[PDB]
Amino acid sequence: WVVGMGIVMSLIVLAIVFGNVLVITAIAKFERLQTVTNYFITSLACADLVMGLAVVPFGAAHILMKMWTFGNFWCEFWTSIDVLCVTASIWTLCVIAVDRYFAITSPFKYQSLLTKNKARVIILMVWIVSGLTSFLPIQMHWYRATHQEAINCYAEETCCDFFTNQAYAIASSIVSFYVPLVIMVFVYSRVFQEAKRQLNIFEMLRIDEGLRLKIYKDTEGYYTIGIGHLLTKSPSLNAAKSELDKAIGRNTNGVITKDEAEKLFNQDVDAAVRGILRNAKLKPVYDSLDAVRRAALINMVFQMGETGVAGFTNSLRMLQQKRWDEAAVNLAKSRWYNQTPNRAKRVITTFRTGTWDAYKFCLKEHKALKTLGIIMGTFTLCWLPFFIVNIVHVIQDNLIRKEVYILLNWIGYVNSGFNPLIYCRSPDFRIAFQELLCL
Ligand SMILES: CC(C)CCC[C@@H](C)[C@H]1CC[C@H]2[C@@H]3CC=C4C[C@@H](O)CC[C@]4(C)[C@H]3CC[C@]12C
Numbered sequence: 112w113v114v115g116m117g118i119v120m121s122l123i124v125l126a127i128v129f130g131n132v133l134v135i136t137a138i139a140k141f142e143r144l145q146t147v148t149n150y151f152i153t154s155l156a157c158a159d160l161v162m163g164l165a166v167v168p169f170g171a172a173h174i175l176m177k178m179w180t181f182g183n184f185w186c187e188f189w190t191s192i193d194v195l196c197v198t199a200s201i202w203t204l205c206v207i208a209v210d211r212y213f214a215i216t217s218p219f220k221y222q223s224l225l226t227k228n229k230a231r232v233i234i235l236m237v238w239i240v241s242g243l244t245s246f247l248p249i250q251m252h253w254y255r256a257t258h259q260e261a262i263n264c265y266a267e268e269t270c271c272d273f274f275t276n277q278a279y280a281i282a283s284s285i286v287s288f289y290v291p292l293v294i295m296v297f298v299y300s301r302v303f304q305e306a307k308r309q310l311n312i313f314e315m316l317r318i319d320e321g322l323r324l325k326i327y328k329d330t331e332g333y334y335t336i337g338i339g340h341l342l343t344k345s346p347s348l349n350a351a352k353s354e355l356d357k358a359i360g361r362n363t364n365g366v367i368t369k370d371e372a373e374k375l376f377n378q379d380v381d382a383a384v385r386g387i388l389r390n391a392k393l394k395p396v397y398d399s400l401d402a403v404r405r406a407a408l409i410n411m412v413f414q415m416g417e418t419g420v421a422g423f424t425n426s427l428r429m430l431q432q433k434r435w436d437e438a439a440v441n442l443a444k445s446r447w448y449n450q451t452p453n454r455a456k457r458v459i460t461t462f463r464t465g466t467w468d469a470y471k472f473c474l475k476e477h478k479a480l481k482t483l484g485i486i487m488g489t490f491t492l493c494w495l496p497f498f499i500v501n502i503v504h505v506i507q508d509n510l511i512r513k514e515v516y517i518l519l520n521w522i523g524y525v526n527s528g529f530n531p532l533i534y535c536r537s538p539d540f541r542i543a544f545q546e547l548l549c550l
Pocket residue numbers: 150153154157158161192231234235238
């Protein structure tokens with residue numbers, strides 16, 4: 112039996128060290144991943160690396176041997192490092208949540224207001240302050256209990272059970288875990304709401320239209336470039352390049368920058384807007400719609416044209432009469448829904464609710480925010496039961512057992528190995544991992 116669990120704990124130790132070193136190396140090697148967000152992720156990965164190298168191995172030894180053979184010095188230093196890493200992780204995540212809040216509320220959406228040199232200082236202080244609040248109360252004996260069972264364990268070298276006084280157990284839990292948790296959960300819930308609120312048609316079209324810097328053929332087969340900007344309907348490749356050289360004003364050779372792609376995207380959206388106001392059929396429909404449904408109407412005009420969207424005589428009728436559910440059924444009863452289902456479904460669903468439920472976490476930066484949300488969420492689900500049980504044991508010290516306390520602590524220790532697997536979501540990290548593993 113002892114072996115069966117010893118192997119499991121060894122696979123945990125290895126998974127944490129392997130995965131976190133891989134995360135740290137990728138952010139330190141590849142310039143594309145050297146962003147302010149990934150600096151905090153590095154801080155988070157190092158906390159988990161110290162957890163897998165200096166905390167879990169000695170924790171596993173303490174359980175299987177049922178005693179502490181590392182002396183009274185390492186017992187306290189080990190406990191301090193354990194408390195440090197958890198504190199450093201939750202505060203780093205809180206800082207990430209705050210960083211992402213100020214990034215999305217500003218016009219430089221998804222870009223951190225903090226510079227790289229300032230971000231390193233934040234991290235440094237998050238480890239210095241967490242260093243003092245974790246080590247000092249343990250090294251200066253402010254944590255120690257005064258009852259007999261506890262004093263026997265402190266004197267005995269072979270005992271390393273973490274007995275604490277009621278004051279420390281509450282004060283440390285609130286300052287080290289609950290305060291940054293509540294703020295993180297409150298501040299990052301707003302981040303998901305700002306993402307769902309501030310996204311307009313410039314992101315809506317960018318998502319379902321895509322972006323390519325080179326000349327490609329659309330679903331219909333015509334030469335297109337950028338964010339669905341149709342160059343020509345002619346089957347000639349040089350005709351497409353000729354219309355591309357005309358539109359931009361230089362010899363592009365069928366290749367453009369992201370700037371030029373956005374400049375054309377602004378012109379196409381404005382031309383769609385103007386075209387709706389021009390067309391007598393689309394003109395009253397656009398006025399009767401709210402800011403979100405207007406974007407859904409411009410989306411259709413961007414894809415089919417003003418003349419094509421004017422064909423929906425029954426759909427346009429009911430969109431002005433506030434009959435969303437019926438108008439959405441008629442949009443499904445058209446060749447547009449049959450041709451491009453995934454896109455039409457999202458546009459129809461936008462007319463349905465009048466919200467952005469269909470475009471949730473579809474944009475690249477939104478998936479990046481969702482990933483960060485999973486990192487925070489997993490940390491909460493893995494550590495909250497331990498801390499809840501920690502405060503419950505202070506109130507009534509005869510409700511939770513020792514085995515239950517240690518088990519929930521290990522659900523928290525196994526959380527150190529989850530992050531690298533969760534980073535696979537990000538396309539930048541996948542490429543980076545399989546490059547370091549030489550695959
Ligand atoms: C020694 C044990 C107990 C814990 C101490 C680990 C400390 C020194 C580690 C953990 C995480 C670390 C930081 C993680 C990320 C960055 C950003 C990087 O671009 C420069 C260094 C910097 C700022 C690190 C400095 C050192 C750091 C604070």
